[PDB]
Design a protein around this ligand. Structure first.
Ligand SMILES: [K+]
Ligand SMILES: [K+]
Ligand SMILES: [Zn+2]
Ligand SMILES: [Zn+2]
Lengths: 146, 145
């Protein structure tokens, strides 16, 4: 399984064929035990970011507000609404709010039954920072620019 | 059994939560393209103005987010207006049908479903008569034949 970025233009998502902070919208926390998935909205102030992490469970993200850059393993991808991102199992990921004034808002869909996030260590960081674009974008407490 | 929910949105806040003739389908993340890992599939549907989805019920749920145009959704005995970015939870076994309202702007919506899921069941005459007890539903629904 590889991660996919599906950019949208005029309600057509790239790579698809046309055939004829947190608000938990739907799922266990909101009173719905029936779906196999939980549906959340996240909002991040400009300059803000999610935690750089990996886990077995996948993500399906749709940007609905503002601008993002997503770290996907060895790639940094700019996003705007209504771009969709599939984050594959065990892919390192971090979403950054990159707009000037407009907060980033995105839908995030995950399995109802899912594992815990795992943080990168020194070797994880050193390996992933062999890419200059990734090194420049990622934020941990021991890693910022320079 | 669970209730269907409409969560209307204004300025990226959905009510009910706290801050802490058919459709053209694009499968954004799904099994055909090889995304077997998630427990769910994520699709975008587009319905031409005046169009409608198939009136049906099934055990599996829907989570819908309207992202384009105007909608009216039948949810059992209710007819509910929708605009982006309203979210709808369609509970197990609820009769549902989505209608594209508005002159020239197509209706576009995100639809998320379980990857492991049952087949849609159509209404017969008895189901239709039952749901047409509500005059709003009766005027809204569209069936073939
Ligand atoms: K876009
Ligand atoms: K709205
Ligand atoms: Zn994650
Ligand atoms: Zn359905």
């Amino acid at each position: 399984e590889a991660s996919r970025v599906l950019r949208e233009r005029d309600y057509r998502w790239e790579g698809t064929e046309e055939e004829a902070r947190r608000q938990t919208l739907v799922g266990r926390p909101a009173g719905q035990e029936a779906p196999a998935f939980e549906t959340r909205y996240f909002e991040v102030e400009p300059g803000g970011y999610t935690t750089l992490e990996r886990h077995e469970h996948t993500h399906v993200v749709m940007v609905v507000r503002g601008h993002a850059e997503v770290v996907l393993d060895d790639r940094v991808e700019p996003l705007t609404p209504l771009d969709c991102v599939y984050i594959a199992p065990h892919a390192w990921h971090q979403i950054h709010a990159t707009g000037a004034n407009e907060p980033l808002g995105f839908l995030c869909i995950v399995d109802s039954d899912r594992d815990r996030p795992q943080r990168p260590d020194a070797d994880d960081l050193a390996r992933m920072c062999a890419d200059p674009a990734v090194a420049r974008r990622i934020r941990t407490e021991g890693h910022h620019h320079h």
